[PDB]
Design a protein around this nucleic acid. Structure first.
Lengths: 49, 118, 206, 102
RNA sequence: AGUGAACCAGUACCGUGAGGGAAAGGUGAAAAGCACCCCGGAAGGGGAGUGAAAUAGAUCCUGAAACCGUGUGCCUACAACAAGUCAAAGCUCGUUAAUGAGUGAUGGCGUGCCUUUUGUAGAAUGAACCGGCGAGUUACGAUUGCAUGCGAGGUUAAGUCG
RNA sequence: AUCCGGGAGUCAGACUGCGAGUGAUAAGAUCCGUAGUCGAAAGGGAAACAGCCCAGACCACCAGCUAAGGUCCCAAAAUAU
RNA sequence: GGUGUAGUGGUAGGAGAGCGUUCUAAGGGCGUUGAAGGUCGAUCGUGAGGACGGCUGGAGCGCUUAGAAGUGAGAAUGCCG
């Protein structure tokens, strides 16, 4: 293996998902959270159980 | 490692403004005005590709009616006559004949008149 | 696997049979990728910081009132959207290093040296001796064996005159036989190892 | 001298010496083509035949395979935060006419 | 951006006071930083000179947009226009050469963008315009999918040499 | 279709047939059941018109046949029998 | 690779695959016979986008493969000019 031709194994690395970056990606404008409510707030949600 | 937002936005915006050449006033000079106007033009052009094909059919039909009433027929009787004889000319070629080759149009109108004479 | 032997100038002074568990074992290519990536992320010094809202030297007072002024409600002169304010989610001091399990370290070492051997890219030599540290004689030696690429020079021990002579040549790297890494062997085109150092490497990779 | 032919899914008016654009044909440039279906042979006297004129063909030579100019089809729904954009260029072939049926 | 502060900054400025607190980097390799003349009270300008370059002349590297002007090819004083889009005569040009470019009388069709809503052209909400900045990150745990090494086994932590 | 597992969003609906209650067998009223469209659906008809009638847009054409609704002129097709 | 058949409106939301910015490594390159940046053009691709040519400009910058992120702006009665 030469340092100018590296290749990881297939299926081993994936990219990432970035929310709030435009409409056509699928997750712009509220970033998967739906409309209003306690679960749409930063730090929103109820404790486990 | 910090990423300045240097020259990407100006390229995109200048691509949008170039599509707005010829518009009125602040609609070819300001980016927001041009953005909205260009979106509306896209909508209009898609709509009008489909409406074009209707306009020319009405134009041909009215010219054919005009020509046929000179040969003793109307549009609907002449179309029926041509179908009962197995003739398959477009309304486009029919109108083109009606304006250029009146003798060809009369040959055809006589065939139609004989077909529905039965 | 047998490699040919040379002297500081000469010819084919026979051959040298090396281990088959170390120098002839069919390399594994993803293990080498993992080793290279781990080692490169292991050299970072992650010394980077920025100031959030509460570290910027600034104000605790509400700048105007909450209503009436025909304004927009503001909370401090140092908010993320104000010019000169604090940064939301910047770089923090971090580590960047991790460890792979012990059998795959050893598998990557074996695999990279065995790849070097499987293409006649390792060159064995009886000895490298020098009465003074002279760069010019090392370059002559290097051309004596017709070596025209990037080369890793693996030496034994307190062979200090040779390491001095081989420094400073811009195609040459020098390492001792107790200190070879995976990144040293992959980057060079060839390895020039002495007979003594070869047995010493076979003693530690076992 | 006139002839009307069915090509593509449409009809065209034809003449010796003139060049015509048409849907893509499956014939390489420089080779010859025969348009079998003739609808009307005008000119001096017209031959107005039930669907086709018996035994008349039209001969030509392909000159060039090309592409039309580009169309953009863009679609959005006001206030519903969504749009989709697509381009399209259309193939054609150019044909020269020689020897309307004789 | 990075310290509030790359520059005479805890300064100017604000407050009785405790205290709050900025803006502002770049001629050229070398000042060779325009002797002399002309218009003008001066400012400023035009020659002539320096210099590889002055449209590098001190408001001095590059020099975008809003915004303000000057010149021209085409249109416009019987016309109700979300300003375009499709059809189209006349005039004027001649390109990354191909089913060419600018303008356009006249005809059909057509109630901005965003947010929140059962529902919006909305007489519901936001934006004067242009430029810059401005929002799911990391540490440590828990779980699932993928991938690699070993396999009835797997794996080391702190620490020592480096 | 069922079974195991990863990730959600929704818990303000509206009108139009039909069948009931409250109301005065009033309401573009209110509350249930059942079917559709709108929501999240462009295109033709109904002058203009979320929800009615027809019909579900991958794209190109200056080709053809029909749906609901229409054929004196605006405005395409019969001044039809 | 051929050929048939079937499909391809879409808000909340799930799944896939890519475009562009800055920096690191390795390799192969360009540059006062003029880099980046700026301006104009009638050019190419299914989209984000990619080239080539003129003018301006005066010292640095692409491409391939892998890695890491302060990685994309039209709206907050946003902040500064």
């Amino acid at each position: 293996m030469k340092l100018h031709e590296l290749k990881p194994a297939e299926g081993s690395r994936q990219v990432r998902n970035r929310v709030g970056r435009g409409t056509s990606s699928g997750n712009g404008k509220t970033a998967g959270r739906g409309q209003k409510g306690q679960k749409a707030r930063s730090g929103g949600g109820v404790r486990l159980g | 490692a910090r990423v300045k937002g240097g020259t990407v936005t100006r390229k995109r915006r200048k691509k949008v403004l170039k599509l707005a050449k010829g518009y009125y006033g602040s609609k070819h000079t300001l980016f927001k005005s041009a953005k909205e106007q260009v979106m509306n033009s896209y909508y209009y052009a898609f709509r009008d590709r489909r409406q074009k094909k209707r306009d020319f059919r009405k134009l041909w039909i009215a010219r054919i009616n005009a020509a046929a009433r000179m040969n003793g027929l109307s549009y609907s009787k002449l179309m029926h006559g041509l179908k009962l004889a197995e003739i398959d000319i477009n309304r486009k070629m029919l109108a083109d004949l009606a304006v250029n080759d009146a003798a060809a149009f009369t040959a055809l109108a006589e065939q139609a008149k004989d077909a529905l004479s039965k | 696997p047998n490699v040919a032997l040379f002297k500081q100038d000469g010819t084919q002074n026979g051959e040298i049979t090396l281990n088959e568990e170390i120098f002839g074992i069919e390399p594994n290519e993803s293990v080498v990728y993992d080793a290279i990536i781990m080692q490169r992320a292991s050299l970072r010094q992650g010394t980077h910081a920025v100031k959030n809202r509460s570290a910027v030297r600034g104000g605790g007072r509400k700048p105007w009132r909450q209503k009436g002024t025909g304004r927009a409600r503001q909370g401090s002169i140092r908010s993320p959207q104000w010019r000169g304010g604090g940064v939301v989610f910047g770089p923090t001091p971090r580590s960047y290093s991790y460890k792979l399990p012990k059998k795959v370290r050893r598998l990557a070492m074996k695999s990279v040296l065995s790849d070097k051997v499987a293409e006649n890219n390792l060159v064995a030599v009886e000895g490298l001796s020098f009465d003074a540290p002279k760069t010019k004689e090392f370059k002559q030696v290097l051309a004596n064996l017709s070596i025209d690429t990037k080369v890793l020079v693996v030496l034994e021990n307190g062979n200090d005159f040779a390491a001095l002579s081989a420094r400073n040549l811009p195609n040459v790297s020098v390492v001792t036989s107790d200190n070879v890494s995976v990144l040293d062997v992959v980057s060079a085109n060839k390895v020039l190892a002495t007979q003594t150092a070869l047995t010493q490497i076979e003693e530690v990779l076992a | 001298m006139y002839a009307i032919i069915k090509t593509g899914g449409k009809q065209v008016k034809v003449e010796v010496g003139q060049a015509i654009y048409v849907e893509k044909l499956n014939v390489e440039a420089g080779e010859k083509v025969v348009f079998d279906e003739v609808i009307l042979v005008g000119g001096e006297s017209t031959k107005v035949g039930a669907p086709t004129v018996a035994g008349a063909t039209v001969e030509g030579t392909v000159e060039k395979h090309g592409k039309q100019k580009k169309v953009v089809t863009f679609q959005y729904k006001p206030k519903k935060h969504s749009h989709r954009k697509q381009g399209h260029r259309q193939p054609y072939t150019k044909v020269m006419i020689e020897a309307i049926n004789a």
